[PDB]
Amino acid sequence: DSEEEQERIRRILKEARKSGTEESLRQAIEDVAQLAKKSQDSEVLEEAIRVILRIAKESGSEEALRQAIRAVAEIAKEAQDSEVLEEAIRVILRIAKESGSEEALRQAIRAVAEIAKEAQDPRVLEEAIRVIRQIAEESGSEEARRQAERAEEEIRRRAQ
Numbered sequence: 001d002s003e004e005e006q007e008r009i010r011r012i013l014k015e016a017r018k019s020g021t022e023e024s025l026r027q028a029i030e031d032v033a034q035l036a037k038k039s040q041d042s043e044v045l046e047e048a049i050r051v052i053l054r055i056a057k058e059s060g061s062e063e064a065l066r067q068a069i070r071a072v073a074e075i076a077k078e079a080q081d082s083e084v085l086e087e088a089i090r091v092i093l094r095i096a097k098e099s100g101s102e103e104a105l106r107q108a109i110r111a112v113a114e115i116a117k118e119a120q121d122p123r124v125l126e127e128a129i130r131v132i133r134q135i136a137e138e139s140g141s142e143e144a145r146r147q148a149e150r151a152e153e154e155i156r157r158r159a160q
Contacts, residue, residue: 033071073111
């Protein structure tokens with residue numbers, strides 16, 4: 001059932017907040033991702049992605065944000081629905097922005113790039129390029145721009 005899985009996901013967050021520790025929040029990211037892996041329902045997958053964003057915000061640590069980005073990318077790789085993939089791409093930008101660190105933005109470009117490689121729908125590829133550009137904008141650094149250009153170019157090389 002869908003609402004069954006969604007409730008379980010929400011409860012992981014609830015129970016992680018009750019614990020109230022950084023360790024519990026990192027574990028909650030992992031637990032939500034594991035639930036999302038063996039799920040096929042798009043509403044569940046989007047819900048998992050949203051909850052991981054909320055866990056990320058609750059923690060705010062560089063490592064939690066890194067792990068959240070990885071978890072969302074993991075969910076997005078095994079997803080087939082384009083709406084889920086585009087949501088995952090936009091949420092990765094939001095997670096990276098919770099920190100704004102050069103490292104987190106770098107991870108975000110890599111994550112979005114990985115999603116784009118697995119995708120088939122050109123609409124997803126367009127969104128990935130769009131958000132990769134925005135990530136580089138958030139950074140402002142020269143290397144972030146060049147990582148984003150190389151990432152964008154590879155997606156276009158795959159598109160042809």
